Structures are given as C-alpha cells and as structure tokens.
Amino acid sequence: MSLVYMNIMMAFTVSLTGLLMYRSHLMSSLLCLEGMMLSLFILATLMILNSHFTLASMMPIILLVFAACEAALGLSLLVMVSNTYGTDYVQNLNLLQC
Amino acid sequence: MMTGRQARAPLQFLPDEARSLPPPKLTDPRLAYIGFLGYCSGLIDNAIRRRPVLSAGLHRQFLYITSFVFVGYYLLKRQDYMYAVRDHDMFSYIKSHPEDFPEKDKKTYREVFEEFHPVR
Amino acid sequence: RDHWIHVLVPVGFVFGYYLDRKNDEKLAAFRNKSLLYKRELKPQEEVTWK
Amino acid sequence: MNPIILIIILMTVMLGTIIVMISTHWLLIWIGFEMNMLAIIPIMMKKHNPRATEASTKYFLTQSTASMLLMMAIIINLMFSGQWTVMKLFNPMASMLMTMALAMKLGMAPFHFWVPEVTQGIPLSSGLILLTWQKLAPMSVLYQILPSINLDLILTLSILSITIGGWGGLNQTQLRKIMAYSSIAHMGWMTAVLLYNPTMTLLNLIIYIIMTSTMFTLFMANSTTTTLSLSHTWNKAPIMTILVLITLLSMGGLPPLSGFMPKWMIIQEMTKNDSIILPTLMAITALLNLYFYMRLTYSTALTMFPSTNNMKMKWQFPTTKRMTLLPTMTVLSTMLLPLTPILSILE
Amino acid sequence: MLKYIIPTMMLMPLTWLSKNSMIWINTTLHSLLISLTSLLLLNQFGDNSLNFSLTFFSDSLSTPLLILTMWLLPLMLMASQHHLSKENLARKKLFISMLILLQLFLIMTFTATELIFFYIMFEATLVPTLIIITRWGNQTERLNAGLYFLFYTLAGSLPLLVALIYIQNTMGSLNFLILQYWVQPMPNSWSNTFMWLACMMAFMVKMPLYGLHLWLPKAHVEAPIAGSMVLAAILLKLGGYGMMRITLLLNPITDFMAYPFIMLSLWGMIMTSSICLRQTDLKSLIAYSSVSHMALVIVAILIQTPWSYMGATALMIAHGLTSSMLFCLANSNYERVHSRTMILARGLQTLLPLMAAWWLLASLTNLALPPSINLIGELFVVMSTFSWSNITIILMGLNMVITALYSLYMLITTQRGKHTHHINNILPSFTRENALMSLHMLPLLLLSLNPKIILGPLY
Amino acid sequence: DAPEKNYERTMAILQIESEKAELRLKELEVRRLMRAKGDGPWFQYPTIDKALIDHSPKATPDN
Amino acid sequence: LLDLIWLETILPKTISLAQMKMSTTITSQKGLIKLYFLSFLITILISTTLLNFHE
Amino acid sequence: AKTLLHQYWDIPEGTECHRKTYAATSIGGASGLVVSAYSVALKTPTSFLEGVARTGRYTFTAAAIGAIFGLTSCISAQVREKPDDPLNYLIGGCAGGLTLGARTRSYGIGAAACAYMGLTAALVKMGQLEGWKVFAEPKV
Amino acid sequence: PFFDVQKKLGVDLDHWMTIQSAEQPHRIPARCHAFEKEWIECAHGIGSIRAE
C-alpha cells in the first residue's frame, strides 16, 4: 500500500510505546494518548479523502470531538491527582497495591 | 449458531410461527417449579427484613409467585419455540442433503463379528 | 384437623404414587405390542395393564 | 451527588452500552464506548477520596488505551475493506488489535492489572456496575466479530485469565479484590467458549451477572468490604450468612446450583469440537476459585467468628437499605439448574 | 421413584412446621414410614430391572443401597438428637434439613437412569455433607477436613464430567439402559487409558482407594455422628455403585488397567488394617477399618466376575450397617468421657453390660463372623480373587487375621480390663442409645436369614 | 407392578431414549456440515445488505 | 511415614504449597501503573513477534 | 515461536541428537526470555546489571532445562529403539526437573519438577501420538 | 447481543455511513463504487462462509 500510511501507523506505534512506557509524568502520558488520537485522525482522513468516500468526511471530526472531550476528562483526573499529591507523578498512585 | 435464522426478523420474542406450536399447560412442572421459586423469593424477602416468614405480606408473596409464573410462561414458550426451530432446521438440512446422510446398511449380529474378550 | 402435620408425608406418598401411575400411562407405547406378551384381548377389557 | 444528575449519568452509562449493542457502524461502537467511560467516571468518584481518584485514573488510562486501539483496528478495517459494517474484520491485524482492545476493556489477563485496583478503589455499587454492566458491551462486540477472531489468541487470553483469576484470589482478604479476581476467571470462562458456541457465552454472562449482583448486593446490605467485617454478619443478620453461603457455593460451580450450569455447558460445547484437554484444565483451575469462595464461607457462615460489644446496639435496628431484588437474585443464582434448557432463549 | 422423592421433600415442611419439642419425633416417625415404604423396590425380576420412567429405574444393585439409605435417616436423627439438644431451634431444623436433603440427593443418585444425572446428584451429595461436617463438627480440624473432603472429590470428579460428556457426544446417550445395548469395546490406546482414568478416579477417591484415602480419617472423625453415619454407610458406596455402572463401558481395557489399582487395594487392605492395630483414636480406628473394608470392594469391582460383584454389593450393605453401628458405639462412649482417645475409658463392660454386648456383636460382624452378610461378602470376594490369582489368598488371609486382631483389640481395650478410676460420669445406657444399636444390628442379623436381596443384579 | 407392565414400559423407555440418541448424533452431524459448508440456516454470519446501495446516476459516469 | 507423611505430602500438601506460591507470585505487584503498561507493551510485542497472532 | 516447535517436531525420535538438543534449547530459551521480560516488567530490578543478571539466570535456567530434556529424550530413544514411546519423554522430563532443581539449588523442588514435568512431557508425547488438540478448531 | 433495533423499528440510525455505495450528498461517487457494489451484490444473503 501507500507510503504515507507506513509513517502514520508508525507514528501511532511510537506514541503507543511512549504511552505504554511511563517515565514520571501523567501529563506526558496524556500527551502520548492525544498523539495516538492525532495519528488516528490523520490516518482516517487520508483514507477517506483518498477513497472519495463523501459521508465519512464527518467521521474524523466526530473522532476529534469525542477524544478531546476524553482528553478533558483525563486532564480533570490529573488535576484531582495533582491537588491530592502536589505533583502529577504516576509513582504517587500506588495506594491500591493493598 | 442459529443467529442467521432470527436475523431476517429481529427482536421478536415470540414469532408468528411460534403460534403453530402448542403452548405449555398451566400445570407444567417447569412452570410450577418457577412458581415455587416465586414462593422462595417471597420467603427470602420476608426473612431478610425480619418479617414473619410464612405469614407477613401474603399479597407480596402472591405477587412474587404470580410474577415468576408470568415471566416463566413466556420463557417456556420461547424455549419450546427455539428447540422446535432447531429440529425443523435439522430435518430440512437432512432432507436437502441426502448425499451427506446415507441410510445405513444395518447388519444383524449373525454377520457382525465382535472380538470376545474373556474375563478370567 | 388437630393433627394436620401427620398427613404431609403420607399424602406426599399418595401423590407420588399417583404421579408414577400417571407416568405409566405416558409410557404405554408398547402396551400389548411386545413380541413376548402380545395377545388377543379378553372380553370386557380394553387395556392389558394400567 | 444530585439524584437527578445521578439518574442522568446512569442513563448515559446505559445509553453508551445500548449504542454499542444496537449500532451497525464502527464509529458508533467507538462512540458508545467513549460515552460509557465518560459517564461512568463520576460513579467511581462518588465519595471523593484519593483511592477513588486513583482508581478512576487507572480506569481512564486503560479504557482510553483500549478505545484508541479499537479505533486503530477500525481504521485498518476501513483500509482493507472500504466500509464500516460491524461484522467480521477483513484483516488479521485489525482482528488482533480489536481482540486486544476488548481484552483490555474486559480486564482479561494479561491486561487484567487494573481490575482489582480499580474495584478496590471504588464503592460497592460502582464496583457492581463495573463488574456486571461494563462486561456487556465488549462481549457484544466479541459476539459480532467472532468469524474473524483468532482462535489461539482468544484461548490464550481465556486460559490465562482463568489461571490468573484463580491464583489472584487466593491471597486476598478484601472482598472487592476477591470479586475482581472472580471476574477475571469468569471472563476467561466466557471467552473460552465464544468461538465454539456464543450462546453458552451469553449463558455464562447472564449467570455471572446474576451471581455477582447477588454478592455485591449482600455486601452492600451488610456494609462489609473485608473478609473480617463479613465475619461479624452471623451476630447481626444470620439470614445473610445463609445467602452468602449458598451464593458462594453457587459461584464455585457446585451442583445442584446454577453456577454449575455455565461451566457444565461450556465443557459440554468444547468437547463437541474435539477439545478435551482444555475444558479439563479449565475445570481443574476453577477449583482455586472454589477454594477462596470456601475460605469466605468458613469465615462467614460455617463458623462463628468473635464479634465485639457494640454489635448489641446494632441488634436494635433493622436494615433500612433498599435491598433491591436480593431475594430474586438469590433464588436465581442458586435454584436455576432444573431450568437448564432455558438457555435456548438466548439462541 | 417419585413416590419416595415426594415424601422426602415433604419432610422439609414436616421439620419446619413442627412444634419445637416435636421436630425430632415427627421426622423420626415419618422417615421410618418412608423406610417401611422402601421395601416396594424389591419388585425385582431375573431378566429385567425395575424400570420406572425415563429418569428413574432400580435394579437389584441400587435397591439395597436405597433401602439402607432410607433406613439410615431415622437412625441419624436418633443418634444426633442428644448432642444437638442445646442447639438453637433454627440451627436444629437446619441440621435436620441437611440430613433430609442428603437423603433426597442419594435416593435419586442411586436411581439415576442417565449418567450425567447420576453425576449431578453424586456431586450434589457433597454440599449437605460439607455443611454438616464444617458446621456441626466438634473440634478445630473440621474446616480442614471439609477442605480435604471437598477437594479430593472435585479433583477426581471434574475429569469424570468431561468423560461423561464425551460419551454423550460419542454414543449419543448416557442412558445406562441404552448403554447396556450400545456398548462398544474400548481398545488399547492412550486416549482410552485416560478415558479409563477419568471414568474411574472419582469413584476411586469416593471408595476410597489406598493412597487417596486421606480425606477420610479426617472427614469421618471430625464430622458429627450423623455425618459419620452417612459418610461410612452410603457415601463410600456411591463410589462402588458408580464403578459397577461405569465399568460396563470400559472393556476390555479394564483387564490391564486394573492391575495398579488392584495392587493398591490388595496392599492397602493390609496397610490400613495394620494402621488400625496402632490407633489411639477410636473413631480413626473405625475410619481406617472402613478403608480396609472398601479395598476389597475395589478389588471385586476391578476383577468383574459375578461372584465378585455379588460379594461386593453384599459387603457394601454389610459394611454400611456395621460401620454405622461402630461409629454409634464410639459416640455412645464419647458422650460420656468427652474424648475420642481409646485408652482413656477402659473396663466399660463392668459398667455397661448390654452396651458391651452391642460392642461384642459389632466387633463380631466387623471380623466377618459367619453366617453374617459381612462374611458372605468377604467370602465371595475371596472366592473371586482366588479365581483371579491363586496367590491373592495370602493377602486376603493376612487381612482377615489383622482384621480379627484390631476388632477384638478395640473390644478388649474399650470394654475389658480394670475400669478407669478417675472417670465417674459413666451414665447408664439410655433407651435411645440401645435402640440405636439394635436398629443397626437386628436388620444386619435378619439379613443372614434371607440374603438374596443384597446380592445385586446378578444373583 | 406386573412383568408385562415393567417389560413394555421398558420398551417404550428404550424407544424414546434411542430416538433421542439418534437425534443427538444427527444434530452433531448437521452442525458439523453447516459450519463446514455454510449453506444451512445456521452459521449465517451477516453480510452487507444490498438495499443500502444507491443506484441513481451519480456525478461522474464511470462507476 | 506413609499415611501421615508421604501420602499427605505428595498429593495435597505439595499442590497446596504450589498454589500458595503461585498466588504469592501473582499478587506481589507494587501498584505501579508504569510497570503494568510496560508489561502490556511486552505482551503486545510477544503477540506480534513471538506468537504470530496478527498472521 | 511456532517455527521453533516445527523445527523441533519434524525430526524423528532418536535420530539427530544435536539438532534435537539445540531446538529444545532454543524453545526453552525463548520461554526463559518471555519469563525474563515479564519478570523485569512487573518486578523492577534495582539496576541494569541486576536486570540482565535476572534475565540471564532465567533464560539459561530454562534453556538448560530444554537442553537436558532434548538430550535425555533423544539418547533414550536411541538406546531403547522405541521412538513412538512416551517413556522417553518421561525420562527427559525428569532430567529437566532435576535440572530445574539443580538450578534452584534444592532437592525437593527437583523431585516435584521431575514428577510433574515428566508427566507433562509424557502427556505431550501422547498428544503427538493420538493427535490431541489443545487449541482445537471449532467444527460443530 | 446485536439487538437490531434499527431493523425492528425501521429507523436508519447509521446504515447511511456504513458503505461507500450508499446514498451520497449530491450523488458523489466513491472511487471504488462499482467494485464495492459488485462485492456487496455478490455476497448478499449467502452469509460470510459462502461469501469468503
């Protein structure tokens, strides 16, 4: 298949392995999650414009709206975690081991 | 398995060909067992709230019994419908494919040689 | 009845005996049809066993 | 929480599940999962303590990652099929990614690592919603995509879920973690029979939801979150010990109870397809589930643990909790095995 | 069989609607009426089994186990009403409900026409037994004993479920009456080897086999007396019943699959009798005696000659009555000295002479004194194992010597010698206790007069 | 009961159970053939409804 | 030696201790989200490269 | 890792011992790498050298198990001249169990691993003989 | 649990974006309209097993 699809899928997997390997910050995790969304947006858009599939032109907008509302939910979770522990570190979220 | 059968007409609890089937009698032992489950639900409902178990809320025990019988009657109708559908599809598929269901040449035990294994 | 509890188990046995004798009617597909016990019916008799 | 806002948010949870269950388009499936997560996040944060914020954050990260892998599977499907019908997937990579995404949404092993943490972090009613209602929509999608599900993948996830949910509950004394590892083992049982007969999958899901709803409703009505707090139930309400006894004996798969029905039908439909080793190892592995269930019955109903003095004051007060459908769910979770051929209504 | 299932279920409202001083008398009376009614199952024929319905039938194997089961319930109610006298009324009704429900499961376990119904009832008999042991057991070890009792049986029986559903998919049916005519030979393969193990190991655990018997001297000891009675008298014989059904299907592979288990049981009847020679616990001595007696039943089923099946079903009925009476005698001393240590209460014939007569007769039936059906079953198993191999007479005779030794050692230790001085709460024998002993022993002696009703389908 | 009653009742029982066993073996064979070949009323996993297709003259002719 | 030690050791005690040890290996997690998602990445890498579930 | 199992099971028993031992070693080493990867995943080692030490220890342990398993099974099939026989894999599984006991430096672990891994390898050989499927394809 | 509410009630909630050969705004053809129409009209009604 086309050459740009390789780079957009590899961008998804790069932001995936970034999201699947935390360093310290939950904000960087959410940045990797929305980079995954960005790569999904571009990949869906290139398919739908390439195919001239007219009605699915509204599909990436619905993807963008739902996942940005999801991002707002995640930022509010990070804000409540930061008001609990002072930072946004994922090593502070370890109370549920016991 | 039978999901393509009930896909031409979706979300029908009892289709129109279910009425060709005889309904369960109201003295069905399955339906009487479901009524016994209604009575048991009434007894547990009197027990968890520390009411007298056999006496209190006879209207409530009777609505438990009635509601379980009422749901279970239609459940038994759908059960008998789906097994009738299963047998109907089985027999029509056997009829449409005789090459896959050959009528077996049955031999009698005067020709059948079975190896005898002595217990000694 | 003052002693109504002493007829739970005996009436239960009578009811189970009745249901066994009722099920014997549903299992009557070979009544007077077995090759060992088939026979002509005696007069004033419609079934060989109940 | 405002009761109006509570009712609207629970209707939105149910709406997202229904949108997954009825829709024929993959975008609407993804929309239903998004709406479902977005609405269930306040139910987990109902009490506003740091364990609920941690549980909601872990749940958000897992379900968000699964939703993005679901959309990647959908996008690879749009590449290799040019369409959007919710049916079989026209690429094994899309099938693998969607099976991974649904395994993350169900919390099946080895994506199971959120379920006991999130279930411990949240109340018993929200844990009930998470372990019963949130299993409905991904099992519906797995019910629809099964002509393209890889067999080795789904059975690996299934047996790994059964084994890890067996060994996980043996170390636990918190009731919510016991129910979560019970969830992992039973989701393994559900997905093991999926490609063989998905009607038995729906039977296992329905019997599981009945029994788990019974156990969470008993744990709510007794206000017990640990083993040792459940141990005081004999001196407070002795009927509750009987009900948790018969429901834990049911969930262990003992005849003549209805928790034996799903695993017996699963073994019944897996031996038809010439699989003998796998349902036998699954059945032997479920004895671990039965072991920690019998541990809870020993601590609750079969022995009398020591109570304290302040229980005498609680003797003077009845339960004013709405124990909604608790006798009905207790009867259906135990006395349904004579009605085992009722499963044909799910055909 | 519905005329026995329905009154056993009607014993539940009979035990929950009874007056609070009447809940033992009513259940005892109506379970004695059910036990009287049990004798209608002796309508047996030389060719056909008594085939009731699509669900229930009774040949001459299941019929003595049924009559023994329906006879055991009033005796368990008599045995267990003294130590549960100070119990709560609701917990007393729950105990009686567990006994009635275990009888209800057993009477449609033995009559199961189809084998998966047998499996469901067979594994349903765990739950009231488990509740009885772990709830009304006396010491600390009842919880561990309930664990061993549950998890040996389910570990053995969950392969049996896969085996029976495999036979259901292959033969098309698990009806035993159809499988009497559609049985195919089971040849030598590894698939059929594990088929044999899956069909047999559950019942080997339930008998118990030697080496797998470790659930038994904790479950039979840590139970109450009604639990010990039902476990010794019926629940070991579920295994032999299932073996005699399921070995229809396992031919000719049993003719070489039986050798390790025949070695295990022929050596286990020596080793467990030797264990009985050195027991300090009287109740554990009776438990290992039960293992020693059921080893012969295992050998008799595995050699599958007609004399072996006749002796095995006679020995199952005889051992049910004898072991139930030995546990009841042990309870009659435990309710006085409050210890199961056998060396503690000595010289009891000087204090309880008629109870010592009951000890003498149960020890004589334990050592298989002719013409008791103990000796009939013992002797027919010895005849068939001699025809199997002539060198098994050494092990059978050495077992009989050790059996006589531990039986009369039990008798001499508890009943003879100088009495223990510091024990002074040795009450006289109650009428309940002597009536319990006689209702065990007198059917066991009357069955020597007409022993043909306990010799199975092939008398 | 008589030996006649027990005998002929046993024959009815054996007929009913042998017929159920033959129907179970046929049910397994029907399921195997319908999953293998896919031409029965069972295992009909859905395809796209062709009523959704627009058959109008579009904007460009080459389609 | 047989029937308090070895026949108790071979079937029930060793199996109980093995399931105890596996239960302690499963539930000895440190509650760290980093480690669980790193294990998820290792899972996806094994499923692609080592188990060929995408093929 | 399916090709590891193919390049193991293609060879007849008791014929080509070096390739049998090397293929079983590679199967065991792949298993040890999977266990090592999940071990350094869920349990953080204190250092990079600690992590590669755990990886090397687990991988060499399972690879030595596979090596002594394949060696003992193929040599027993040579010296006993019965290739279609699960007793050879019983002997190889006990050799691998004693290998796991020697790597864990304990005798009772070695006896338990001998018994259960020998029974498991015997079961795998019987599944190769009668054609037992663990991931059986849905047919009805 | 594909509860086909759309076919039950006759509503068209999402069948319109489902395929490329559906009704499009201003009758715009997809670049593979004919190929998708041929594959759908082939595979219609015969199920997935016969359609593959």
Side-chain angles (χ1 to χ4, degrees), chain B residues 11-35:
Chain B
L11 290 175
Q12 294 177 355
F13 182 77
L14 288 172
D16 191 75
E17 65 180 0
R19 301 177 70 191
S20 297
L21 294 171
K25 294 182 180 179
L26 295 175
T27 61
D28 196 358
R30 296 177 294 175
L31 189 61
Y33 177 67
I34 301 166

Short mmCIF file of all heavy atoms in Angstrom, two decimals, chain B residues 11-35:
data_model
loop_
_atom_site.label_atom_id
_atom_site.label_comp_id
_atom_site.label_asym_id
_atom_site.label_seq_id
_atom_site.Cartn_x
_atom_site.Cartn_y
_atom_site.Cartn_z
N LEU B 11 -35.46 -9.15 16.96
CA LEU B 11 -36.02 -8.73 18.24
C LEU B 11 -37.46 -9.19 18.44
O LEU B 11 -38.23 -8.54 19.15
CB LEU B 11 -35.93 -7.22 18.44
CG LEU B 11 -34.54 -6.67 18.66
CD1 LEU B 11 -34.64 -5.19 18.69
CD2 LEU B 11 -34.02 -7.17 19.96
N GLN B 12 -37.84 -10.30 17.83
CA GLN B 12 -39.13 -10.91 18.07
C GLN B 12 -38.97 -11.94 19.17
O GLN B 12 -38.24 -12.92 18.99
CB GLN B 12 -39.68 -11.54 16.79
CG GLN B 12 -39.99 -10.52 15.73
CD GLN B 12 -40.45 -11.16 14.45
OE1 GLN B 12 -40.46 -12.38 14.32
NE2 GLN B 12 -40.85 -10.34 13.49
N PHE B 13 -39.62 -11.70 20.31
CA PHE B 13 -39.55 -12.64 21.41
C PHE B 13 -40.26 -13.94 21.07
O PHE B 13 -39.72 -15.03 21.28
CB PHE B 13 -40.16 -12.02 22.66
CG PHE B 13 -40.09 -12.90 23.87
CD1 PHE B 13 -38.90 -13.05 24.56
CD2 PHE B 13 -41.20 -13.58 24.30
CE1 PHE B 13 -38.84 -13.86 25.67
CE2 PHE B 13 -41.15 -14.39 25.40
CZ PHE B 13 -39.96 -14.53 26.09
N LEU B 14 -41.47 -13.84 20.53
CA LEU B 14 -42.19 -14.99 20.00
C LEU B 14 -42.66 -14.66 18.60
O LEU B 14 -43.59 -13.84 18.44
CB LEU B 14 -43.36 -15.37 20.90
CG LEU B 14 -42.96 -16.01 22.22
CD1 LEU B 14 -44.14 -16.17 23.13
CD2 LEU B 14 -42.32 -17.35 21.94
N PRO B 15 -42.05 -15.25 17.56
CA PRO B 15 -42.51 -15.02 16.19
C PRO B 15 -43.89 -15.57 15.89
O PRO B 15 -44.52 -16.21 16.74
CB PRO B 15 -41.44 -15.73 15.35
CG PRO B 15 -40.24 -15.69 16.20
CD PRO B 15 -40.73 -15.87 17.59
N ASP B 16 -44.38 -15.33 14.68
CA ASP B 16 -45.72 -15.76 14.32
C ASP B 16 -45.82 -17.26 14.10
O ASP B 16 -46.90 -17.83 14.27
CB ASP B 16 -46.18 -15.01 13.06
CG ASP B 16 -47.65 -15.20 12.78
OD1 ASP B 16 -48.47 -14.59 13.50
OD2 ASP B 16 -47.99 -15.96 11.85
N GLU B 17 -44.71 -17.91 13.75
CA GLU B 17 -44.70 -19.36 13.64
C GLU B 17 -44.57 -20.05 14.99
O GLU B 17 -44.68 -21.28 15.05
CB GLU B 17 -43.57 -19.81 12.73
CG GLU B 17 -42.21 -19.50 13.28
CD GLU B 17 -41.09 -19.94 12.37
OE1 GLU B 17 -41.38 -20.50 11.29
OE2 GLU B 17 -39.91 -19.71 12.72
N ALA B 18 -44.34 -19.30 16.07
CA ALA B 18 -44.39 -19.90 17.40
C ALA B 18 -45.80 -20.25 17.81
O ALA B 18 -45.99 -21.08 18.71
CB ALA B 18 -43.80 -18.94 18.44
N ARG B 19 -46.80 -19.65 17.17
CA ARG B 19 -48.19 -19.92 17.48
C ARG B 19 -48.69 -21.21 16.85
O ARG B 19 -49.76 -21.69 17.23
CB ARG B 19 -49.03 -18.73 17.03
CG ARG B 19 -48.60 -17.44 17.71
CD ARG B 19 -49.38 -16.25 17.22
NE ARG B 19 -50.76 -16.28 17.66
CZ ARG B 19 -51.70 -15.47 17.19
NH1 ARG B 19 -51.40 -14.58 16.26
NH2 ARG B 19 -52.94 -15.55 17.65
N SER B 20 -47.94 -21.78 15.91
CA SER B 20 -48.28 -23.09 15.38
C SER B 20 -47.99 -24.21 16.37
O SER B 20 -48.50 -25.32 16.20
CB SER B 20 -47.50 -23.36 14.09
OG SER B 20 -47.83 -22.44 13.08
N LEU B 21 -47.18 -23.95 17.38
CA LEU B 21 -46.72 -24.82 18.45
C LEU B 21 -47.72 -24.81 19.61
O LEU B 21 -48.32 -23.78 19.89
CB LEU B 21 -45.36 -24.37 18.94
CG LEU B 21 -44.25 -24.53 17.92
CD1 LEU B 21 -43.01 -23.86 18.44
CD2 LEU B 21 -44.00 -25.99 17.66
N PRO B 22 -47.91 -25.93 20.29
CA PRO B 22 -48.82 -25.94 21.43
C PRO B 22 -48.18 -25.24 22.62
O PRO B 22 -46.99 -25.45 22.90
CB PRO B 22 -49.04 -27.43 21.70
CG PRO B 22 -47.81 -28.08 21.23
CD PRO B 22 -47.32 -27.26 20.06
N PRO B 23 -48.91 -24.39 23.31
CA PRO B 23 -48.35 -23.68 24.45
C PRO B 23 -48.15 -24.62 25.62
O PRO B 23 -48.73 -25.71 25.65
CB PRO B 23 -49.41 -22.61 24.76
CG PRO B 23 -50.65 -23.21 24.29
CD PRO B 23 -50.31 -24.00 23.08
N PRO B 24 -47.29 -24.26 26.57
CA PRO B 24 -47.20 -25.04 27.80
C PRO B 24 -48.50 -24.95 28.57
O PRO B 24 -49.14 -23.90 28.62
CB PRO B 24 -46.05 -24.37 28.57
CG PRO B 24 -45.26 -23.70 27.54
CD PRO B 24 -46.25 -23.23 26.52
N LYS B 25 -48.90 -26.07 29.15
CA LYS B 25 -50.04 -26.07 30.05
C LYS B 25 -49.70 -25.28 31.30
O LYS B 25 -48.54 -25.12 31.67
CB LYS B 25 -50.43 -27.50 30.40
CG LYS B 25 -50.95 -28.30 29.22
CD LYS B 25 -51.36 -29.69 29.64
CE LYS B 25 -51.89 -30.49 28.46
NZ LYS B 25 -52.27 -31.88 28.86
N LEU B 26 -50.74 -24.76 31.95
CA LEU B 26 -50.51 -24.03 33.19
C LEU B 26 -50.21 -24.95 34.37
O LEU B 26 -49.89 -24.45 35.45
CB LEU B 26 -51.72 -23.14 33.49
CG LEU B 26 -51.94 -22.03 32.47
CD1 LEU B 26 -53.21 -21.27 32.78
CD2 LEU B 26 -50.76 -21.08 32.45
N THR B 27 -50.32 -26.26 34.18
CA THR B 27 -49.84 -27.26 35.13
C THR B 27 -48.53 -27.89 34.68
O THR B 27 -48.26 -29.06 34.99
CB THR B 27 -50.90 -28.34 35.33
OG1 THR B 27 -51.16 -28.99 34.08
CG2 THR B 27 -52.19 -27.71 35.84
N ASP B 28 -47.72 -27.15 33.93
CA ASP B 28 -46.39 -27.60 33.54
C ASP B 28 -45.52 -27.70 34.79
O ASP B 28 -45.50 -26.76 35.59
CB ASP B 28 -45.81 -26.60 32.54
CG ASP B 28 -44.62 -27.14 31.75
OD1 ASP B 28 -44.17 -28.27 31.98
OD2 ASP B 28 -44.13 -26.40 30.87
N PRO B 29 -44.83 -28.82 35.01
CA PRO B 29 -43.88 -28.90 36.13
C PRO B 29 -42.76 -27.88 36.09
O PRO B 29 -42.27 -27.48 37.15
CB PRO B 29 -43.35 -30.32 36.01
CG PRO B 29 -43.73 -30.79 34.67
CD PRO B 29 -45.02 -30.14 34.39
N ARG B 30 -42.34 -27.44 34.90
CA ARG B 30 -41.37 -26.36 34.81
C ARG B 30 -41.97 -25.06 35.33
O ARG B 30 -41.35 -24.36 36.14
CB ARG B 30 -40.90 -26.20 33.37
CG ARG B 30 -40.16 -27.40 32.83
CD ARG B 30 -39.79 -27.21 31.39
NE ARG B 30 -40.97 -27.15 30.54
CZ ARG B 30 -40.95 -26.90 29.24
NH1 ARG B 30 -39.80 -26.66 28.63
NH2 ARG B 30 -42.08 -26.86 28.56
N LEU B 31 -43.19 -24.75 34.92
CA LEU B 31 -43.85 -23.53 35.36
C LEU B 31 -44.22 -23.60 36.84
O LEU B 31 -44.16 -22.58 37.54
CB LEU B 31 -45.08 -23.27 34.50
CG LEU B 31 -45.77 -21.92 34.67
CD1 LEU B 31 -44.80 -20.83 34.31
CD2 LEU B 31 -46.98 -21.86 33.78
N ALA B 32 -44.56 -24.79 37.33
CA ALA B 32 -44.79 -24.96 38.76
C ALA B 32 -43.51 -24.81 39.56
O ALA B 32 -43.54 -24.30 40.69
CB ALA B 32 -45.44 -26.32 39.03
N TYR B 33 -42.37 -25.23 39.00
CA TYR B 33 -41.10 -25.01 39.66
C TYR B 33 -40.74 -23.52 39.70
O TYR B 33 -40.20 -23.04 40.69
CB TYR B 33 -40.00 -25.81 38.97
CG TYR B 33 -38.63 -25.59 39.55
CD1 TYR B 33 -38.34 -26.01 40.84
CD2 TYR B 33 -37.64 -24.97 38.82
CE1 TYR B 33 -37.09 -25.81 41.38
CE2 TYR B 33 -36.38 -24.77 39.35
CZ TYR B 33 -36.12 -25.20 40.63
OH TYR B 33 -34.88 -25.01 41.18
N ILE B 34 -41.07 -22.78 38.64
CA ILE B 34 -40.86 -21.34 38.64
C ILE B 34 -41.78 -20.65 39.66
O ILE B 34 -41.38 -19.68 40.32
CB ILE B 34 -41.05 -20.78 37.22
CG1 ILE B 34 -40.06 -21.43 36.26
CG2 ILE B 34 -40.73 -19.32 37.17
CD1 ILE B 34 -40.37 -21.20 34.81
N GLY B 35 -42.99 -21.17 39.83
CA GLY B 35 -43.86 -20.66 40.89
C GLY B 35 -43.33 -20.96 42.28
O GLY B 35 -43.47 -20.15 43.20
#
